[PDB]
Amino acid sequence: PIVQNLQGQMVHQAISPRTLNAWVKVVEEKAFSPEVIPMFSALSEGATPQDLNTMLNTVGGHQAAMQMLKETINEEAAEWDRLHPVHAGPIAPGQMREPRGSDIAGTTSTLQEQIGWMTHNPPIPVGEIYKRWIILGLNKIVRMYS
């Protein structure tokens, strides 16, 4: 997650192993029932896309469901690109390239670029946007679990 330090700014902290474990335990007991969606959203506040993928990659089993999810995230990434055409550069010092779909999902962006977007002013909230995609994906795969 991104958090504020004693001096004012937002800075990166690593995901808590206890958060991860809570998530793991919710899935073991509940599978992908509806009630997991609000759990995920609560447990992922301020998460970077790398944090979000750690949470998803800890789920054991539910392989059908996880592929469904990935396919939904992939649709949203493609639609983001369709609606945000790339603008030719050069990149000014202090600036960052504009995130693509793949970047927001963490596939092509490093943790430092993610921190870079999430802490810019004005912020490009790649964490919040990816989480939205994931939550849509969860709202689809929970059909298999009523």
């Binding site: 055409p85 790339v86 603008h87 030719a88 550069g89 000014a92």
Partner: protein
């Protein structure tokens, strides 16, 4: 002796001044030929009437998106885009003319004029020329920029062609 192109620059329709460029066709012949042909408008499309849509003071002025006018467009005389010819020339200071791109080998029509030394652009953007006369016009264009590139006035290429 290197081809020479000129731009007459205007702001909200009123003349500002002419800027002229030497194009280093010996070092990067295809990239220089693209910019010259686009400046004369000899293949029926090019720079005349288009805008410097992104000006960042202390950095550069960027124009040449004659299709979509915001940096998402542009095309070369070789097709949608062409490869990075080489990176022999570097960003050594103000007046350097270089290709804007969206990653390696995606040169189209967009270019920038450096208003400082932009060393970290070396090996990313193809440098193909330099301002020969009228660096005061580019220094006067800077005024109308902003830190994110948005301009407070329409900076247009009122006219252009080849001097030499």
């Amino acid at each position: 002796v290197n081809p020479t192109v000129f731009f007459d620059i205007a702001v909200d329709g009123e003349p500002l001044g002419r800027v002229s460029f030497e194009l280093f066709a010996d070092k990067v012949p295809k990239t220089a030929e693209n910019f010259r042909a686009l400046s004369t408008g000899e293949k029926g499309f090019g720079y005349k009437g288009s805008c410097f849509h992104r000006i960042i003071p202390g950095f550069m002025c960027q124009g040449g998106d004659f299709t979509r006018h915001n940096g998402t467009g542009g095309k070369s005389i070789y097709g949608e885009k062409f490869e990075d010819e080489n990176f022999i020339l570097k960003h050594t200071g103000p007046g350097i003319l270089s290709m804007a791109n969206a990653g390696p080998n995606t040169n189209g029509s967009q270019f920038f004029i450096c208003t400082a030394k932009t060393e970290w652009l070396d090996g990313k953007h193809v440098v193909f020329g330099k301002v020969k006369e009228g660096m005061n016009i580019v220094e006067a264009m800077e005024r109308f920029g902003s830190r994110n590139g948005k301009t407070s006035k329409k900076i247009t290429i009122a006219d252009c062609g080849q001097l030499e």
